[PDB]
Amino acid sequence: ENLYFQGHMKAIVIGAGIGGLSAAVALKQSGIDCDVYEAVKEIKAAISVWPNGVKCMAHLGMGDIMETFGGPLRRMAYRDFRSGENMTQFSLAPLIERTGSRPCPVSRAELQREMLDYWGRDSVQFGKRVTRCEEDADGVTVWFTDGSSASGDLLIAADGSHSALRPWVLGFTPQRRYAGYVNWNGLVEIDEALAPGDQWTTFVGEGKRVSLMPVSAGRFYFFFDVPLPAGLAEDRDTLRADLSRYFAGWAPPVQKLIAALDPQTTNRIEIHDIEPFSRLVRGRVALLGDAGHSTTPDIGQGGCAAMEDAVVLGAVFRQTRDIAAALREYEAQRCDRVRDLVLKARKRCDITHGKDMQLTEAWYQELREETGERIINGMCDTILSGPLG
Numbered sequence: 001e002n003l004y005f006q007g008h009m010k011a012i013v014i015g016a017g018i019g020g021l022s023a024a025v026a027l028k029q030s031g032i033d034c035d036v037y038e039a040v041k042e043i044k045a046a047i048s049v050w051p052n053g054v055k056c057m058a059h060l061g062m063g064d065i066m067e068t069f070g071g072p073l074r075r076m077a078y079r080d081f082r083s084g085e086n087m088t089q090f091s092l093a094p095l096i097e098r099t100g101s102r103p104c105p106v107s108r109a110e111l112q113r114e115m116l117d118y119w120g121r122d123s124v125q126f127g128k129r130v131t132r133c134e135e136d137a138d139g140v141t142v143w144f145t146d147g148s149s150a151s152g153d154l155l156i157a158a159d160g161s162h163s164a165l166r167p168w169v170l171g172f173t174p175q176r177r178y179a180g181y182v183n184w185n186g187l188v189e190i191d192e193a194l195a196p197g198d199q200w201t202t203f204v205g206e207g208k209r210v211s212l213m214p215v216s217a218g219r220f221y222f223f224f225d226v227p228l229p230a231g232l233a234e235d236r237d238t239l240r241a242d243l244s245r246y247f248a249g250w251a252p253p254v255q256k257l258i259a260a261l262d263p264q265t266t267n268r269i270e271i272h273d274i275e276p277f278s279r280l281v282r283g284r285v286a287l288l289g290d291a292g293h294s295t296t297p298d299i300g301q302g303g304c305a306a307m308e309d310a311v312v313l314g315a316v317f318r319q320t321r322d323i324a325a326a327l328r329e330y331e332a333q334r335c336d337r338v339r340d341l342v343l344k345a346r347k348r349c350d351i352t353h354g355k356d357m358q359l360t361e362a363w364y365q366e367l368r369e370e371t372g373e374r375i376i377n378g379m380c381d382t383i384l385s386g387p388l389g
């Protein structure tokens with residue numbers, strides 16, 4: 001009856017990705033007991049964690065993970081696809097000073113592992129795939145495909161971009177929108193024949209991108225973007241040849257990358273987003289992370305946004321036990337932010353990948369005249385609009 005006492009407030013968190021584990025950690029900080037449920041039986045290339053996300057991780061008590069595994073990112077450059085020459089290059093030092101943290105690219109595998117380690121695998125029930133939630137005046141209940149169910153006071157749906165709970169919260173089923181390009185990504189060992197080990201290097205041209213950024217342990221996170229129709233007959237077996245075709249004529253470092261990579265460990269993903277929602281919560285249930293907002297990766301803010309969601313979620317429960325009031329405040333704080341992030345990503349996606357090839361050529365022109373000041377400013381804007389400023 002006094003809801004502050006241990007065992008009187010139970011949150012059910014669905015999903016053990018970045019969002020779910022962040023949310024559980026944040027809820028626990030605010031004195032709420034969480035049971036975490038995850039669909040897959042076992043976990044299974046990288047994420048750029050900008051300073052807004054880093055400060056969130058620090059706030060959540062998980063700062064050591066970022067310091068330890070974050071790649072040494074200190075500068076960036078854009079290179080011409082033919083010449084391979086610098087169009088613009090500059091250090092990120094100024095951004096790090098304005099935002100208060102260094103950027104931390106981290107391998108997805110390592111980030112996930114460390115966060116599970118931190119939360120503790122024993123407090124996660126795997127093979128638990130949620131199908132339905134229902135709420136009464138007393139609480140909320142969810143059902144799992146294996147026939148079990150669980151009840152609690154609060155439900156956090158952090159079940160990803162294909163969220164099963166999302167339709168119940170919204171009242172309809174949003175659909176994923178193909179963003180018009182395909183991303184190939186993976187990891188390779190740092191070889192300065194490709195690019196500098198402390199910088200994020202992107203080759204641009206023809207509405208395409210080839211990118212390298214350092215994660216931990218002397219490795220590069222790499223990705224290739226190509227504007228393409230969805231559904232092409234292309235997989236890991238067709239991979240090297242596909243990339244060779246798509247990037248014919250591109251500077252030698254790119255050919256070096258295509259030869260260096262391992263197709264068996266390289267991901268090919270057709271990029272989608274979802275039109276932003278105007279609601280994130282319903283009763284005792286809140287969407288968090290990709291479940292509440294699904295963006296293209298184009299400004300590297302997807303995982304950061306889920307961390308931001310969690311920080312705000314913990315904060316709204318810090319000094320209240322009125323679930324309905326807390327979740328309305330969560331929604332109030334998050335909804336405009338994640339809308340802007342999805343739309344910002346979308347716009348950048350469209351400029352980068354030649355939706356209008358002239359706008360794209362104009363962007364390349366701006367990169368030729370770029371000192372770094374305008375880009376740094378733009379990045380700071382995105383970062384400083386986060387909950388921890």
Ligand SMILES: Cc1cc2nc3c(=O)[nH]c(=O)nc-3n(C[C@H](O)[C@H](O)[C@H](O)COP(=O)(O)OP(=O)(O)OC[C@H]3O[C@@H](n4cnc5c(N)ncnc54)[C@H](O)[C@@H]3O)c2cc1C
Nearest residue numbers: 015017018019039048129130160289290300301302303304
């Ligand atoms: C190619 C690419 C590059 C990216 N780069 C960046 C970047 O540089 N920086 C950045 O900040 N973000 C980046 N992102 C975005 C980032 O990866 C995601 O936003 C982030 O992983 C979302 O976390 P999440 O927990 O909400 O979703 P997920 O990581 O997808 O986790 C959801 C979890 O829920 C589980 N689940 C699904 N359905 C059910 C069910 N019904 N019942 C129970 N559990 C279920 C899933 O198994 C999964 O473990 C990138 C994304 C992509 C695709």
Ligand SMILES: O=c1[nH]c(=O)c2[nH]c(=O)[nH]c2[nH]1
Nearest residue numbers: 048183185223297298299300
């Ligand atoms: O602009 C991008 N930033 C990223 O952090 C990222 N990650 C990715 O796969 N594609 C992109 N694009």
